[PDB]
C-alpha cells in the first residue's frame, strides 16, 4: 500500500529533474575544465527511484544498473556533457594508482561470450583478447592509468565492479580515493 | 450501482492528475476524474472532481481522507449529492490540459507580415482612435500634431 505523500514527493522529484534536464539541454555544455582528456572513476549511488529516459539511456551506455557499480570514463566534451546529465545519480573524480591497482586485484572480472568470469589466469585474459598489445594484468593497469588507444576494448572487456556496501564511510577531486578505500 | 462524484479541494502542488487517479484507485475503481485549471496559464486551481463507479467506496474515501494534512494542506473531501451533480461537469475528464503559449502567439503575430491593405486598416484604426483620444485630452487641454 502506498500513501499520497509518496505520490506528491515522486511528482516533485520528477518535475525538478525535468526542469533541470531542460536547463542543461538549453545551456551550452561547457564545463570549467581544460580541453585535455582526463580519466575519472564513476560510482553510481542510490537516489531517485524513477529514472527519466535520457538518464537511463546514458547509464545503460555507461553500463551502470546493478548495486554499487563503478566504471572508469574518459573526460572530453561529450563525456563531460553525459556525466553532467546524470550528476545526481553518480559520483565521479580522479582515482589514484593504488586505488585502481587494489580495486582490480581484489575485484577484477572479465566478460566474454556474454558471460562473466573471475580473472583466474593470465592465459585466460590472453585467450580473451589476443592481439591488441595487452599481455598481462599489469598491462591493463597502466593502460587504464596512462592514456592510450586501447581504452574502449579493455573497458568493454572488464565487468564493472560490485563493491561492498559501506557502514558509514557535488564534485570533488581527491575524496573519491577515501570513498573507494571504504567501498572495498 | 449509481456512480459517486467526489469534490476534493485544497490540493497540494503535486497531487494533480495521475497521483489522484492512482491513490483513489487503491480505494476503488474510478470512472472519471478532472482537475479544474486556468485558461491563460496551465495550472491547477487546487480543486478536482473524481467519479467512482461505486458510491459506497466514494463515501469511504471521502470520509477517511477528508481532513488529511498533506504537505501543509488540510484537504476538503466532500461527496457531491446525486441531486446537485452538474451534467457536463466532467467535460474535460481523462484528458491532458496542454500548456499553450498565448503571449508568444501574440508576439509572433505582431511579427507576422501583413501584406498591403491590412496596413491601411492599421492606419485607419490608428487615426480614429487618435481622434477619440484627442477629444478626451482636448477636454482637459493638450495639443498634438503629426
Amino acid at each position: 500500500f502506498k500513501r499520497a505523500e509518496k505520490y506528491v514527493k515522486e511528482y516533485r522529484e520528477q518535475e525538478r529533474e525535468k526542469i533541470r534536464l531542460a536547463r542543461i539541454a538549453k545551456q551550452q555544455g561547457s564545463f570549467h575544465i581544460p580541453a585535455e582528456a582526463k580519466l575519472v572513476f564513476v560510482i553510481r549511488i542510490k537516489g531517485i527511484n524513477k529514472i527519466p529516459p535520457k538518464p537511463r539511456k546514458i547509464l545503460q551506455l555507461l553500463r551502470l544498473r546493478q548495486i554499487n557499480n563503478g566504471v572508469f570514463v574518459k573526460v572530453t566534451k561529450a563525456t563531460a556533457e553525459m556525466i553532467k546529465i546524470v550528476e545526481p545519480w553518480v559520483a565521479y573524480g580522479y582515482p589514484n594508482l593504488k586505488s585502481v591497482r587494489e580495486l582490480i586485484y581484489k575485484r577484477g572480472y572479465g566478460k566474454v561470450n556474454g558471460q562473466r568470469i573471475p580473472l583466474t589466469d593470465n592465459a585466460i585474459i590472453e585467450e580473451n583478447l589476443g592481439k591488441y598489445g595487452i599481455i598481462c594484468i599489469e598491462d591493463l593497469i597502466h593502460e587504464i592509468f596512462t592514456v592510450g588507444p586501447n581504452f574502449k576494448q579493455a573497458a568493454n572487456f572488464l565487468w564493472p565492479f560490485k563493491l561492498s556496501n559501506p557502514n558509514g564511510g557535488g564534485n570533488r577531486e581527491e575524496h573519491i580515493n577515501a570513498l573507494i578505500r571504504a567501498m572495498n | 450501482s449509481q456512480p459517486g462524484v467526489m469534490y476534493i479541494a485544497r490540493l497540494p502542488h503535486g497531487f494533480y492528475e495521475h497521483e489522484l487517479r492512482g491513490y483513489f484507485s487503491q480505494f476503488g475503481e474510478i470512472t472519471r476524474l478532472r482537475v479544474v485549471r486556468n485558461k491563460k496559464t496551465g495550472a491547477s486551481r487546487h480543486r478536482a472532481f473524481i467519479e467512482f463507479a461505486d458510491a459506497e467506496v466514494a463515501d469511504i474515501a471521502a470520509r477517511t481522507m477528508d481532513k488529511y494534512l498533506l504537505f501543509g494542506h488540510i484537504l476538503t473531501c466532500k461527496i457531491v449529492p446525486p441531486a446537485q451533480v452538474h451534467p457536463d461537469l466532467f467535460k474535460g475528464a481523462n484528458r491532458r490540459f496542454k500548456v499553450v503559449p498565448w503571449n508568444k502567439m501574440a508576439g509572433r503575430q505582431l511579427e507576422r507580415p501583413l501584406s498591403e491593405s491590412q496596413w491601411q486598416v492599421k492606419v485607419a484604426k490608428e487615426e480614429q482612435r487618435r481622434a477619440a483620444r484627442a477629444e478626451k485630452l482636448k477636454e482637459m487641454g493638450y495639443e498634438f500634431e503629426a
Binding site: - | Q26, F27, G28, D54, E56, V57, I60, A61, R63, T64
Partner: peptide, 22 residues
C-alpha cells in the same frame, strides 16, 4: 462484486488510517 469492492475499500481505509506496519 459489491461485497468485494466494499471489503477492498474498508481495507484501504484501514491502511490509510491505522497504517500498514503491524
Amino acid at each position: 462484486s459489491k461485497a468485494a469492492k466494499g471489503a477492498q475499500a474498508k481495507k484501504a481505509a484501514q491502511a490509510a488510517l491505522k497504517g500498514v506496519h503491524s
